[PDB]
């Protein structure tokens, strides 16, 4: 039995399908189901919304995630509203991800839990770029974002590998302001949020123009002021 | 920026890359630290090409490995 | 930079891309132009409408304009 309870939420999507709705003047069909996590191409295996959105048929959804080559191969996302990338934020000496205290983890930098959530963009990108990396990440898999944010207060998280926007989001309510974003997320992945629209879509063109009109009209900095309510 | 630079104007409103790259080689001039505007500027097409897709996903392709990243930080990114 | 994402896209693909600088040294804007009263743009974003520039690597301001 499944509960179709008609609950009500308010956040950043809510907000972006509203001004949607509000400016393009359309009908949807919103609905929260209990899917997995991201999906890619590992053994063919879709599961969440990405792989709910991989297939035809589906118009749209408000959820815009880190762009990558499935992710883009198989439908055609919307221009990336943001430019927060793949950055790391340890819980001060390093420089980000070029230290070369992860190449040879032996002496310095022994092996510590440097995974990520499981099935996610970043590991399909540490995959593709470095496999001893991944390899790391998957033995020293760590829990989801909620258990990773309670070690990284804490202190037993070294670090969190995800996007800037991510990071910053998770630095604005931080108590005491102990953990630093060492270098922002634009020299590393310098990716995006596309919203994940389908292929061939009529739609596509006017999302693109709602979007292009909503970070072009001025509304930005309001935006940036409302949203990321970092103090520290 | 020849203006800017030799004391004749206020100040200079242009691209961030560009004003901290001109920060990082003129010491005189030191940019502020606001930053709005944060969107990615995409290389403009035709209106009916048939490779407007195909050089987007070239473009994807290269910047997801580490080549443009590091090409930027090694060409754009000049610190003394 | 640009010569390098140039080369690398040619490695990829295998187009034939075509170097060269812009007579003019503006981007143009949307307004009333004095030519016939075409609402475009004058500059190298209006040769890219005639047909003398294919590709503009420059990368311009995304918007709804």
Redesign the interface.
């Known amino acids: 039995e499944g509960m179709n309870v008609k609950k009500c939420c308010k956040g950043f999507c809510i907000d972006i399908l509203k001004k949607l709705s509000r400016t393009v003047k359309f009908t949807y069909d919103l609905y929260l189901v209990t899917n997995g996590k991201h999906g890619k191409k590992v053994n063919n295996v879709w599961n969440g919304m990405i792989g709910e959105v991989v297939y035809q048929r589906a118009v749209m959804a408000v959820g815009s995630l880190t ?3 499935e992710r ?2 198989v439908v ?1 996302f919307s ?5 927060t990338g793949i950055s790391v934020m340890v819980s001060d000496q390093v420089t980000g991800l070029s230290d070369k205290k992860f190449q040879r983890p032996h002496d310095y930098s022994p092996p510590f839990r440097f995974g990520t959530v499981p099935n996610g963009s970043t590991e399909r ?1 540490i995959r ?2 470095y496999p001893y990396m991944h390899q790391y990440m998957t033995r020293f898999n760590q829990r989801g974002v909620e258990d990773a944010l309670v070690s990284l207060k804490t202190g037993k998280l070294d670090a969190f590998i995800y996007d800037a926007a991510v990071l910053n989001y998770k630095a604005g309510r931080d108590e005491g302001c102990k953990l630093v974003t060492i270098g922002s997320g634009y ?6 949020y596309g919203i994940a629209l389908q292929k061939g879509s009529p739609w596509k063109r006017q999302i693109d ?1 709602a979007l ?2 909503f ?2 009209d001025g509304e ?2 309001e935006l ?1 002021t409302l949203w990321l309510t970092g103090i520290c | 920026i020849q203006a800017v630079r030799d004391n004749k104007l206020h100040a200079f409103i242009w691209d961030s890359a560009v004003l901290e790259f001109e920060a990082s080689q003129k010491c005189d001039l030191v940019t502020t630290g606001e930053l709005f505007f944060r969107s990615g500027f995409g290389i403009g097409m035709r209106k009916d090409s048939p490779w407007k897709q195909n050089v987007s996903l070239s473009i994807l392709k290269s910047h997801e490995n580490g080549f443009m990243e590091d090409l930027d930080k090694t060409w754009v990114r000049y610190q003394e | 930079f640009c010569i390098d994402l140039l080369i690398k896209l040619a490695r990829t693909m295998n187009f034939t891309y075509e170097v060269h600088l812009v007579a003019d040294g503006k981007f143009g804007t949307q307004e009333r132009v004095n030519n016939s009263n075409k609402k475009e743009w004058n500059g190298m974003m209006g040769e890219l409408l005639s047909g003398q520039a294919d590709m503009i690597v420059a990368p311009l301001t995304i918007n709804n304009e």
């Open positions: 762009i990558n080559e883009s191969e055609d221009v990336p509203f943001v430019e990108n593709n770029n020299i590393f992945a310098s990716t995006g123009l292009l009109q970070v072009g930005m900095e940036e």
